[PDB]
């Protein structure tokens, strides 16, 4: 459904993965930052488009960007 992309400016603060309401983001090993960790979006099929993740990023400009797109039952948050 929606598209979430992570950029090299990430600092591995883990704040984004701790804010997702649907477990779409994970922290994976990396060497480009001091923390030695980067964020990934393995399960974008469950993204609802809340953008809470973006609100949590501390980088000058979001290192995590959510681009809204095709809509499915899951993305539209339909319990019915």
């Amino acid at each position: 459904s929606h598209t979430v992309k992570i950029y090299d400016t990430c600092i591995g603060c883990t704040q984004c993965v701790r804010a997702c309401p649907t477990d779409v983001l994970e922290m994976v090993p990396w060497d480009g930052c001091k923390s030695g960790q980067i964020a990934s979006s393995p399960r974008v099929e469950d993204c609802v488009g809340c953008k809470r993740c973006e609100t949590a990023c501390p980088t000058d400009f979001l290192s995590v960007r959510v681009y809204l797109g095709a809509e499915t039952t899951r993305s539209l948050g339909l319990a019915y």
């Binding site: 598209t3 477990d23 994976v28 980067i38 990934s40 393995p42 400009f61 960007r65």
Partner: protein, 132 residues
């Protein structure tokens, strides 16, 4: 192993029976009252507990509440109409907020957000700048 609840009009509907359904499980050390996302209050059982919901978010919301009770053994599954089940969370046994060796990066762009291509350049291509 269902927790003690008296019923509500905010439970699941047909989609749960014809499209898809979700289920969370956890273990408790005491019988305590929790608030369910559907609306209302329920009492968990002293031991294994199972509850069904219609959305993954509803399940994960309850997990947050469970963490307050110091319960961190919760598991979430998706049950399809035919009976097939998918284990969803914690996927690799380790919570996502904790780096676990063995997980590969996905959807990562190796440059600052400002280095994406110009829209005009990719015209009549079908791709987007952020996917280019």
């Amino acid at each position: 192993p269902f927790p003690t609840f008296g019923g509500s009009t905010g439970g699941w509907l047909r989609a749960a029976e014809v499209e898809e359904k979700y289920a969370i499980t956890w273990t408790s050390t005491k019988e305590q009252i929790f608030e369910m996302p559907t609306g209302g209050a329920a009492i968990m059982r002293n031991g294994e507990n199972l509850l069904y919901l219609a959305r993954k978010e509803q399940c994960l919301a309850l997990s947050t509440q469970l963490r307050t009770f110091k319960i961190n053994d919760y598991k979430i599954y998706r049950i399809f109409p035919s009976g097939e089940v998918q284990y969803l969370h914690p996927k690799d046994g380790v919570f996502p907020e904790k780096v676990n060796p063995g997980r590969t990066s996905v959807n990562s762009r190796g440059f600052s957000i400002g280095k994406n291509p110009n829209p005009a350049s990719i015209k009549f291509s079908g791709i987007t700048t952020y996917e280019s």
